[PDB]
Symmetry: C2
């Protein structure tokens, strides 16, 4: 048999699939470096499917530190431990249990996990490649080197640094952190000269969030070109957006594409829905693939899952927004299984343990029996039909209801879940920590699923305290 070590923490392939998928085929062992990062339902899936579990004991100081929260937007809690230490912890756990492989669904641990794998002679992302995938400046340089759509980009520390960039890069302009997630601090520029009395506010805002002491950024911000979208050169119907993600496996340095996902449009920069698989035509998908191939091999990644965001630009130029050496979040990975029957968690484990003896698809998965959409509603969506006032520093919610007749064609609601009756929702916090409803749709016609979603976003009834 084979023993897989999982560094268990937030994001990526969700726990409700990951542990069962892994334990089906492997002896699963869990390391939990951040016990506070672990929801109650998460802990329960860890304990249920792992033959062994270790938590970093330094975290527990009283009995109440043994409490599991119901939900965690982000680990807003100091992890004051340098990278070399994390690596050591991982190596130690892997040796204690004779791990044949190490994976993680959490970005924060990708770098250190690569280092341990190399030291242990196990398959991994590759030490340098993981560095590249974790510093945005290094990720950019590598992409340019790899020959995918190349754009201007400067490291940014001060405002004195901000001037030289704004002047060079121009409008539209993106400035964002080198190391963080959930699009925090990621700032847009359509006005030309307010940027300054607006860079100095988002310079501070990065000093309230928390990451571990183990993610190296050689400069705090990057500035680079905003990738302009051109919806009409790509999609043939309304309902999607001008970006996509594609999911893949890297095996032995080679990129294997699995599935591309369509999106419904964002709100600000918060994502709303992921549709499995894309309706995009085969030529378009071939360009998307080709670009993710170059990007990811361009990082040097060896053995890992990938999640790559690509902006659909004019002339069908695919523009690399970002790639990570871990599974997509939300429900994308489960939905790939439901549609095609392929379990990408298992597939990656087969790669970590057996290399190209794993059964990797030859090209994107095809012959989808139907489309599955992973969708979320947010407060903004309702404020986007009036339901919320613009002074309303909070609101409380009793029910969210989907009237009948919104579904187009054979679309169908598979599941739906609303936030708890009496739920306190402060409306001066980011929306991507603020999903107040969640639904899945199935259907054999993509444009209608997509349209059915627009309709739910429009007409779903909130009942709440104004």
């Amino acid at each position: 048999s084979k023993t897989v070590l999982v560094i268990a923490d937030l994001g990526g392939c969700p726990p409700h699939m990951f542990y069962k998928s892994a334990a089906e085929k492997y002896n699963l062992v869990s390391f939990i470096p951040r016990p506070f990062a672990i929801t109650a339902s998460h802990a329960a899936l860890i304990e249920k499917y792992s033959v062994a579990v270790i938590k970093d004991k330094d975290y527990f100081k009283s009995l109440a530190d043994f409490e599991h929260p119901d939900s965690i937007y982000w680990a807003h809690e100091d992890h004051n431990k340098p990278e070399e230490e994390v690596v050591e912890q991982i190596v130690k756990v892997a040796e204690m249990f004779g791990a044949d492989a190490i994976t993680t669904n959490n970005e924060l641990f990708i770098a250190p996990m690569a280092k341990a794998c190399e030291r242990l002679g196990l398959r991994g992302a590759g030490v340098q490649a993981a560095e590249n995938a974790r510093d945005k400046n290094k990720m950019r340089d590598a992409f340019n080197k790899a020959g995918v759509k190349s754009i201007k980009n400067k490291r940014v520390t001060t405002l004195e640094d901000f001037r030289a960039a704004l002047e060079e890069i121009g409008t539209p302009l993106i400035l964002k952190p080198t190391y963080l997630a959930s699009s925090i601090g990621v700032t847009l520029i359509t006005d030309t000269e307010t940027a300054e009395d607006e860079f100095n506010r988002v310079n501070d805002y990065l000093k309230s969030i928390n990451v571990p002491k183990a993610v190296t950024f050689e400069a705090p911000f990057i500035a680079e070109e905003f990738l302009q979208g051109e919806y009409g050169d790509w999609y043939q119907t309304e309902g999607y957006s001008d970006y996509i993600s594609i999911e893949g496996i890297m095996a032995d340095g080679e990129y294997f594409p699995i599935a591309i996902h369509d999106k419904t449009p964002q709100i600000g920069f918060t994502e709303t829905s992921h549709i499995t698989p894309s309706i995009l035509d085969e030529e378009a998908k071939k360009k998307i693939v080709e670009a993710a191939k170059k990007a990811n091999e361009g990082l040097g990644l060896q053995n890992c899952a990938t999640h790559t965001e690509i902006k659909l630009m004019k002339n069908r130029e695919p523009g690399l927004i970002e790639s990570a050496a871990r599974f997509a979040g939300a429900n994308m990975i489960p939905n790939i299984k439901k549609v095609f029957g392929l379990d990408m968690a298992q597939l990656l484990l087969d790669v970590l343990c057996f290399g190209k003896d794993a059964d990797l698809p030859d090209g994107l998965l095809d012959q989808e029996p139907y489309y599955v959409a992973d969708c979320h509603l947010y407060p903004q969506h309702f404020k986007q039909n009036g339901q919320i006032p613009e002074t309303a520093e909070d609101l409380v919610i009793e029910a969210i209801d989907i009237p009948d007749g919104l579904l187009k064609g054979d679309t169908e609601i598979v599941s739906f879940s609303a936030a708890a009756p009496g739920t306190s929702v402060d409306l001066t916090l980011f929306e991507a920590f603020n999903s107040i409803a969640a639904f899945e749709l199935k259907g054999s016609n993509s444009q209608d699923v997509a349209e059915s979603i627009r309709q739910i976003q429009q007409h779903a009834k909130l009942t709440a305290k104004y």
Copy 2:
């Protein structure tokens, strides 16, 4: 700090106290040799309070072996692994986590745990002493040697072996297994000569239950004198029974008594209630102590908790029924904490880790603010007011209700729990796998608590399908 390894399985100090008590003061690590022995609520308390958990992985063959039952009467499941193997497993886990101590609440693991502790140089029961406490014949010989009430006793294998015993020991006569728990096969003899066409039925019945492959019995049965009780030489009021248990800690070979428990009377040989602490007078308790001191030092036990059952015989002779080198079961250990504020789980851990530097009471705990009673109702109790027919191979239950006005004096019901509406109860199974209700009473007058219990057993309303 200090790392305690718990071999987690059934019985003893119940999980709802043990893990929280241990984790309060120690870094707790759990080994689970029998994952099937672990209820859902148990697993959840393990994962919540342990900094590390290992399960014996050989048990998992499909995904469904990862299911936790709600309740487990007994681990009716083959554990085909010889003692030397268990020992090895325990030693390996203790080394993997640098355990400073090992404990268990489950009798089946006492012998092997002593061996590992000795090999590891950690405090324990003592290898021979644990053997003595686990083979009933060896426990008897040791008690006789120790000078506590001595009685006739022969090893029994066949019926040819049964003849020589019955003739020597006489009526009343007890014959029971050397190695099992919950009073299975424990058989009474008031008739003189039916015993034979009744020994040959209870010879077979031991071959349906299961124990691990790691408990040595050099003869399958023992026969010995039934210890006759004489209630009236001990208690001054009605309501108790003619046996007691006493709870203690062995530290460095010396017995430290903690608390004696009264009982309400049994049904068959199933226990009904445990009252913390005994109302027995100080001379009576001094005899009880003195007898448990000799018994337990007589076993040679070094470092462990003890639970010792003593029969209250005529002339105030305390008769040793049995002693185990682990905590009492049911809720006796929690109730000791509630009454006196002493946490005996912690106290034992302090002994395992620090020896007589622990804070051991000097004599039984006194100054009880009040009595707490841990009580259970069974089917028989209701069949003991008609509620069940004598053909009724099963019954289903909707509610069990305590009418008002049954409580005497300032007695009070603290908690009460009935079996689930629609619960299937086969009435050709042992009653001590069959608790269908559970209550706790508090009160400052013992005789009334005891009497309040009799009244609940009498008059509690069942509503069920006849």
